[PDB]
Design a binder for these strands. Structure first.
Lengths: 117, 117
RNA sequence: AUCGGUUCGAGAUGGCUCGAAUCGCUCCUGAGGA
């Protein structure tokens, strides 16, 4: 059972906007998502499960970069500034994968391990 | 020199809004900060220096939680929903420390090391 | 006019229906205006 604070924490960590999360994860309007983050309405179960699943996918993304850093190379990571240039390189992905790509790449750029292209 | 992608990456990692960074870090209008992130105008050096200094404060905070994690403790971290609630417990801080606190609390909640109150 | 971001207000309160402030896109002459 979630809490509005930790729901907002997971949403802000994965670099999602309110309307993007409302359309693609909630399937609700943005006002309903704002009422879930405010505690006026209780967070549903499936939203909790899907956000925990997306955090697991983020851990699977970080494991391969740790695997490459174990091999002594220095990775180059793609930081797409716009969704259309992301979809030019990615046929079968959406805005969630773009946000996950940005949130994974920003971490390893800030820690000094990798480079952004 | 710092590219616009790296500036946007560090800004989105620290959970700062455009207007907040434009007022306190940039001391400019938000229209100019969008030009620095869009690539129409070059990033000034004194913004680069400030963002790297702030990221070092974040690394210091993560080390400070990790030294408590080394004791076998399960730390209960504080996530603040509002700026005035943070200012009640931190009279001499401002909005930047609130955002940094929120990012560190979200990161340690997500990976299972900590609990949120 | 139209379209985006952030923060909020009501209502037999439901994953619902209506609204508000402000910053932008656009136009003019690290800035100011409608």
């Amino acid at each position: 059972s979630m809490t509005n604070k930790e729901l907002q924490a997971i949403r802000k960590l994965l670099m999602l906007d309110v309307s993007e999360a409302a359309e693609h994860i909630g399937r609700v309007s943005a006002r309903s998502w704002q009422y879930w983050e405010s505690g006026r309405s209780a967070v549903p179960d499936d939203v909790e499960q899907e956000m925990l699943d997306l955090a697991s996918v983020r851990i699977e993304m970080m494991s391969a970069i740790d695997k490459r850093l174990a091999d002594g190379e220095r990775p180059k990571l793609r930081f797409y500034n716009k969704l259309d240039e992301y979809l030019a390189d990615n046929p079968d992905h959406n805005v969630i994968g773009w946000r996950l790509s940005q949130s994974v790449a920003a971490l390893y750029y800030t820690e000094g391990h990798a480079d952004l292209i």
